[PDB]
Amino acid sequence: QYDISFADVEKAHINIRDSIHLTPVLTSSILNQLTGRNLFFKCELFQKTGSFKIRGALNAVRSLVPDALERKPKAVVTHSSGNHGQALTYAAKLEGIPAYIVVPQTAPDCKKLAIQAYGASIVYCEPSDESRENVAKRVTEETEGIMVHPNQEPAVIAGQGTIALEVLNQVPLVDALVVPVGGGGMLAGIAITVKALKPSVKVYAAEPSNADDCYQSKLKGKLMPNLYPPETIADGVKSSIGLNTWPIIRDLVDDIFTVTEDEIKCATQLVWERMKLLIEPTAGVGVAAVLSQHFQTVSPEVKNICIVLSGGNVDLTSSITWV
Amino acid sequence: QYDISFADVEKAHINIRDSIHLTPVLTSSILNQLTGRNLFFKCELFQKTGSFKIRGALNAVRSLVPDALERKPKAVVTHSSGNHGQALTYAAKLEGIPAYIVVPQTAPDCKKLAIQAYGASIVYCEPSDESRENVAKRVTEETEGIMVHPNQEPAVIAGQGTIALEVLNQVPLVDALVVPVGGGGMLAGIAITVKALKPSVKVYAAEPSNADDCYQSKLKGKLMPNLYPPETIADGVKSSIGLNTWPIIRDLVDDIFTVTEDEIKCATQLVWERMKLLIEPTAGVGVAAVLSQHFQTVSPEVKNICIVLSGGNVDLTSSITW
Ligand SMILES: OCc1ccc(-n2cnc3ccccc32)cc1
Ligand SMILES: *Cc1c(COP(=O)(O)O)cnc(C)c1O
Ligand SMILES: *Cc1c(COP(=O)(O)O)cnc(C)c1O
Ligand SMILES: [Ca+2]
Ligand SMILES: [Ca+2]
Ligand SMILES: [Ca+2]
Ligand SMILES: [Mg+2]
């Protein structure tokens, strides 16, 4: 039916369990006092590499083949330089294979330094997609590597879904999961998992209003990507949903809540100050969603809500700015 | 025998457990690698009010009596707008009584607004130690209230001991606790508890080398307070150890590790960046201790080490400053 099944999520958990953390679920009376609801925080900011994306990246490294004639990937390649590229590098390192990040000439020096500091090699391209594509395909082919998309690669989607296996086991009375959405790999993996195991549990997406393609797609009933690169402090959810995650999200996600830039910032600061968790602003999106006016339309029966705190890869300098 | 015994810690546990968090113990692969040890981090930064101090504060509010007919305090009065005052204020809220903070009339608006944010009621005094003390005495008496010393009050030392009761359950094979020390209420409480329950477990203190009265006292065999108020980023451990906590520390604490300012700062940033826990610098003291050269020489048999991350009440502005 979909590009992944619950069986794929379980194969992923089996494949990755020995190398990731089964992150804790923490609580806050203050947030519980504030939102009306009984909240649980799945702490993927404590995951290896600083975000959940090690789950999908490691599953892809351990499950994908480079070719019909070779079972073992000999390198990994991606155009993503943030959390995904960091996770993919670490996964490659675990498996003893090189990682290549395709980067435009125009990337900030800080981006180039950070990639080299996570242990990946940089391959330069022009800021164009013709270039980026020529370059990554050349690298993938010449290194006998796997290209690992940050959110549309089914092995990636299947790995991110393992968050929901943990949450359901950790929070048996959970009524809903709230998940920040960019490309929708985490959303879709979690929606597959929840709806396979316990479809009475709601799956809700949280998204910046400034980058609201998942909301607009669900509103319209078809895939409507951002027409232009979005501007948001939630830097990890600037991708649009794609052709592999959209059908899952259309059919299996119960609702989308959009949140303003100010809502994201206030929710981020609230978590920093009142929970003492250094979430990245992208991980504040799900918290802003549950605090938002529109989340008041959620039935009072939906009491036990687990919010995925998806990452903690924040720079203090980038902070000082917007705080 | 000391100003408390383990019996007092058990009482404090029953008194407070319904109202505080049984904070988690977390771990860090990178910090295990940097130390060579199996570290466990007791996350008192997640405790109600942002530090462990609610344990001693609540125990005191629920067990001390005012100088009045009614045996229950009708208010709490404090000089502190820090972790102690915040803890006492929350304890007062739980008990449905006002908390008053005595503030010099020349306090900045910023501080006053901040004080009122956590819900304390300001009473003004004149900016001298005489007026501060006399206003607090007056307020305490007129309100039928109580005052609670931040580290030498027996009820406070006993409540802080409850940290160790939880750690010994949460980490059954623990070999050592590392505790930041200022006035030593937390250290003394923990030492009483550990030495009562599993005395083969080591109790180590950690303090800034800029405020090294605990180290000096243990070396000399006698209480040697800081000659002058110390300068340290570790704001929460500027107090010297006192007459009530010293004998406990003298007898029941295995060793003291001192750390420089730079070590404190580096350890704090390491925890922020690698553990994603917003600890205050005072809580970075114990982490710095375990990372320090002196600690590296501790016997390898002391493998499982629980560090108390004592607080997370840090101001963003001050952090930007360093
Ligand atoms: O409120 C205290 C407070 C201090 C520091 C931060 N912070 C923001 N981005 C960061 C990156 C690394 C370390 C700390 C960081 C947040 C909050
Ligand atoms: C990548 C990322 C997301 C978004 O996941 P998608 O699968 O792209 O929807 C959310 N939070 C953080 C911290 C991320 O790094
Ligand atoms: C009060 C405090 C300490 C020190 O406790 P003492 O009992 O005074 O030694 C340590 N860390 C934090 C965060 C504190 O607030
Ligand atoms: Ca979007
Ligand atoms: Ca005495
Ligand atoms: Ca000292
Ligand atoms: Mg498809």
UniProtKB/Swiss-Prot annotation, chain A:
- Residues annotated as binding Mg(2+) 1 are E10
Binding residue positions for Ca(2+) 3: E207, A211, D213
Gene name on record?
SRR
Modification N6-(pyridoxal phosphate)lysine occurs at: K53
A GO biological process of this protein is:
response to xenobiotic stimulus
One Pfam family per UniProt:
PALP
What is the tissue specificity? Expressed in the cerebellum, hippocampus, dorsolateral prefrontal cortex, and in motor neurons and glial cells of the lumbar spinal cord (at protein level). Increased in the dorsolateral prefrontal cortex of schizophrenic patients (at protein level). Brain: expressed at high levels in hippocampus and corpus callosum, intermediate levels in substantia nigra and caudate, and low levels in amygdala, thalamus, and subthalamic nuclei. Expressed in heart, skeletal muscle, kidney, and liver.
Q: What is this protein called?
A: Serine racemase
Mod. after translation: S-nitrosylated, leading to decrease the enzyme activity.
Cofactor dependency: Mg(2+); Mn(2+); Ca(2+); pyridoxal 5'-phosphate
| Entry GO MF terms | ATP binding; calcium ion binding; D-serine ammonia-lyase activity; glycine binding; identical protein binding; L-serine ammonia-lyase activity; magnesium ion binding; PDZ domain binding
- Recorded family membership: Belongs to the serine/threonine dehydratase family.
| Keyword field contains tRNA processing | no
Q: Which Gene3D superfamilies match?
A: 3.40.50.1100
Q: Which residues carry this modification: S-nitrosocysteine?
A: C110
Q: Which residues bind Ca(2+) 2?
A: T78
The residues the record assigns to binding Mg(2+) 4 are N244
EC number(s) per UniProt?
A: 5.1.1.18, 4.3.1.18, 4.3.1.17
Reported function: Catalyzes the synthesis of D-serine from L-serine. D-serine is a key coagonist with glutamate at NMDA receptors. Has dehydratase activity towards both L-serine and D-serine.
Residues bound to pyridoxal 5'-phosphate are: N83, N151, G182, G183, G184, G185, M186, S310
Record-annotated residues binding Mg(2+) 2?
D175
Curated annotation (Swiss-Prot), chain B:
Q: What is its EC number?
A: 5.1.1.18, 4.3.1.18, 4.3.1.17
Binding positions for Mn(2+) per the UniProt entry: E207, A211, D213
Q: Which cofactor does it need?
A: Mg(2+); Mn(2+); Ca(2+); pyridoxal 5'-phosphate
Tissue expression notes: Expressed in the cerebellum, hippocampus, dorsolateral prefrontal cortex, and in motor neurons and glial cells of the lumbar spinal cord (at protein level). Increased in the dorsolateral prefrontal cortex of schizophrenic patients (at protein level). Brain: expressed at high levels in hippocampus and corpus callosum, intermediate levels in substantia nigra and caudate, and low levels in amygdala, thalamus, and subthalamic nuclei. Expressed in heart, skeletal muscle, kidney, and liver.
Biological processes, Gene Ontology terms: D-serine biosynthetic process; D-serine metabolic process; L-serine metabolic process; pyruvate biosynthetic process; response to lipopolysaccharide; response to xenobiotic stimulus; serine family amino acid metabolic process
> Transferase: is it a keyword of this entry?
no
Task: Give binding positions for Mg(2+) 4.
Answer: N244
Highest taxon of the source?
Eukaryota
Q: Name one GO molecular function term.
A: protein homodimerization activity
Q: Where does Ca(2+) 3 bind?
A: E207, A211, D213
**Does the record carry Glycosyltransferase as a key word?**
no
PANTHER family to which the protein is assigned, alphabetical: SERINE / THREONINE RACEMASE FAMILY MEMBER, SERINE RACEMASE
Family, per entry: Belongs to the serine/threonine dehydratase family.
- Summary of subunit composition and partner proteins: Homodimer.
Report the protein name in the record: Serine racemase
Taxonomy of origin reads:
Eukaryota, Metazoa, Chordata, Craniata, Vertebrata
Name of the encoding gene: SRR
